[PDB]
């Protein structure tokens, strides 16, 4: 009858900023860009010229080659990051607790690279040479499916697919599962491997991607000259745990998740609603969920994708929700450094929000060279800010009108 408290007890990540959480976070707080020339595909025929890729990531350092060969990159990242998160949590998933340990990991795009290569085989060799592994490799739920198997996690089990809101919805949904007592632990987050021919083709065809060839200025959220997002890849996975459970086993606690809000624009298939009204409502739902006043928010990790419409409408939504306080709190987009990881965005950004609180550091928005009159909040430009944080809000305002907000709190007994 009483809501369970839910704390963060482990973090795992692969990002363009590093192949673990520490490296990723350390790079973020020093304003290091993960954006560079596209190498994953031939960029000659695309308007987009840069991307945020994993660097020096060899999957075989983490599993047998034969296991990796039966996983699309998106699943590879999720299994690697999930194992990292569980090891960080020092959680021993035994037969006794397996039914109370679940997995809720989403992907926005799933195994598009596998679909592409398998479709080419279909065209040339026929349907009878399609791989027996094609379907399980391509479907987005196989990140959750493979993590479950790798971990022996037999509890509540799902996969949310909501475009850019994916990682944030997934964490909120997992939070709600534990809150109502249906699991003691959830391994949750987002994963994405969207650097593929069709993905670049598709996000260039609707001009969503920046065509800025200069990696030093391509991703520049809130900058007057921003012109679209820079696509990235990776996974961000956390371990959510019921508080008493965590305390009883001596878990380390990063902080507490206290609010989740989800709304829809009901407006347009790709264009965000005017003045960010849907995003404003999602922030408001999350604030009400956390039981706090808006003034208690110290820092907002913005969605901040560096498109014209997002950054402008998100600024407006923030002003609508926080009024005078909107100019008092700090806002930043770490996509200035990581690029937009799509379905994994909310996962990595949840991790940055959590570490911001734990370590008392706000990561900066880099690359703001020309201020935009319509984006006039404090975006923590250029340099990290050392500061004690009690509450941090993270937005994901995804294509398709999916608005998702999480609120994290410093852990106090």
Q: Is the dihedral of CA 36, 230, 196, 263 positive or negative?
A: positive
| 50 is an interface residue for a second copy by CB under 8 A | no
Per annotation, catalytic residue among 159, 245, 268, 303: 303
Q: Helix/strand/coil (H, E, C) string of 318-352?
A: HHHHHHHHHHCCEEECCHHHHCECHHHHHHHHHHH
Query: Minimal CA–CA distance to 60: which of 47, 71, 48?
Result: 71
What does the alpha-carbon distance between residue 365 and residue 93 come to, in Å, rounded to a whole number? Answer: 38
Cβ neighbours around 94 below 10 Å, total? 9
Cβ neighbours around 266 below 10 Å, total? 8
Closest-CB residue for K ion? 228
54-62, 223-231, 249-257, 372-380 -> range binding K ion (CB under 5 A): 223-231
The set of residues, in sequence order, having a beta carbon less than 8 Å from that of 128 and lying 6+ positions away, is none
Site for K ion in 329-358 (CB under 5 A): 349
> Cβ of residue 7: shortest distance to a second copy, in angstroms?
18
What does the alpha-carbon distance between residue 146 and residue 59 come to, in Å, rounded to a whole number? Answer: 15
Query: Is 283 exposed, middle or buried, given 0-12, 13-18 or 19+ CB atoms closer than 10 A?
Result: buried
| 271 is an interface residue for a second copy by CB under 8 A | no
Q: For residue 142, which phi and psi values (nearest 5 degrees)?
A: -75, -10
| 92 is an interface residue for a second copy by CB under 8 A | no
Contact flags string 158-197 toward a second copy, x per CB under 8 A:
xxxxxx-----x---x--x--xx-x--------------x
Output 35 or 164, the one with its CB closest to a second copy: 164
Output 13 or 71, the one with its CB closest to a second copy: 71
| 148 is an interface residue for a second copy by CB under 8 A | yes
Per annotation, catalytic residue among 164, 245, 375, 402: 164
- Asked if residue 215 lies in contact with residue 370, where contact means CB atoms within 8 angstroms, the answer is no
> Cβ of residue 352: shortest distance to K ion, in angstroms?
8
What does the alpha-carbon distance between residue 87 and residue 251 come to, in Å, rounded to a whole number? Answer: 12
Annotated active-site residue 375? The verdict is no
Annotated active-site residue 325? The verdict is no
> Cβ of residue 296: shortest distance to K ion, in angstroms?
18
Output 162 or 333, the one with its CB closest to a second copy: 162
| 394 is an interface residue for K ion by CB under 5 A | yes
Site for a second copy in 352-411 (CB under 8 A): 399-403
> Cβ of residue 229: shortest distance to K ion, in angstroms?
8
26-34, 268-276, 344-352, 364-372 -> range binding a second copy (CB under 8 A): 268-276
Output 258 or 330, the one with its CB closest to a second copy: 258
Site for a second copy in 192-251 (CB under 8 A): 197-208
| 169 is an interface residue for K ion by CB under 5 A | no
Annotated active-site residue 164? The verdict is yes
Angle between helical axes of 277-290 and 308-322 (0-180°, round to 10): 40
Output 156 or 251, the one with its CB closest to a second copy: 156
C-alpha dihedral (349, 350, 352, 358), degrees to nearest 10: 170
Catalytically active residues are 164, 303, 340
């Amino acid at each position: 009858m009483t809501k369970k408290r839910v704390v963060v007890t482990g973090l795992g990540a692969l990002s363009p900023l590093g192949n673990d959480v520490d490296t990723s976070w350390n790079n973020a707080i020093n304003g290091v860009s993960g954006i560079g020339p596209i190498t994953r595909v031939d960029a000659e025929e695309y308007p987009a010229k840069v991307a945020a890729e994993l660097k020096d990531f060899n999957v075989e350092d983490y599993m047998d080659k034969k296991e990796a060969r039966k996983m699309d990159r998106f699943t590879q990242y999720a299994v690697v990051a999930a194992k990292m998160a569980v090891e960080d949590a020092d959680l021993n998933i035994t037969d006794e607790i397996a039914p109370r340990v679940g997995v809720w990991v989403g992907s926005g795009i799933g195994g598009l690279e596998t679909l592409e290569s398998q479709f080419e085989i279909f065209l040339t060799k026929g349907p009878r040479r399609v791989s027996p592994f094609f379907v399980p490799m391509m479907i987005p739920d196989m990140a959750t499916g493979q993590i479950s198997i790798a971990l022996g996690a037999k509890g509540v089990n799902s996969c949310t697919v909501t475009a850019c809101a994916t990682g944030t919805n997934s964490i909120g949904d997992a939070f709600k599962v534990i809150q109502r007592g249906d699991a003691d632990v959830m391994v949750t987050g987002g994963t994405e491997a969207p650097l593929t021919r069709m993905s670049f083709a598709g996000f260039s065809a609707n001009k969503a991607l920046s065509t800025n060839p200069d990696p030093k200025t391509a991703s520049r959220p809130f900058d007057k000259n921003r012109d679209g997002f820079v696509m990235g890849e990776g996974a961000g996975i956390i371990v959510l745990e019921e508080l008493e459970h965590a305390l009883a086993r001596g878990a380390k606690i990063y902080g507490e998740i206290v609010g989740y809000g989800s709304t829809g624009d009901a407006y347009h298939i790709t264009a965000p609603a005017q003045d960010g009204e849907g995003g404003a409502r999602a922030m408001q739902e999350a604030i009400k969920d956390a039981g706090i006043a808006p003034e208690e928010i110290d820092y907002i990790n913005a969605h901040g994708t560096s498109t014209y419409y997002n950054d402008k409408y998100e600024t407006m939504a923030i002003k609508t929700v926080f009024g005078e306080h909107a100019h008092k709190l700090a806002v930043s987009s770490t996509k200035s450094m990581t690029g937009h990881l799509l379905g994994a965005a909310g996962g990595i950004e949840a991790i940055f929000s959590i570490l911001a609180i734990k370590e008392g550091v706000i990561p900066p928005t880099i690359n703001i060279q020309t201020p935009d009159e319509e984006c006039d909040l404090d975006y923590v430009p250029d340099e990290a800010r050392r500061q004690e944080l009690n509450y941090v809000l993270s937005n994901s305002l995804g294509f398709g009108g999916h608005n998702a907000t999480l609120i994290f709190k410093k852990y106090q007994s």
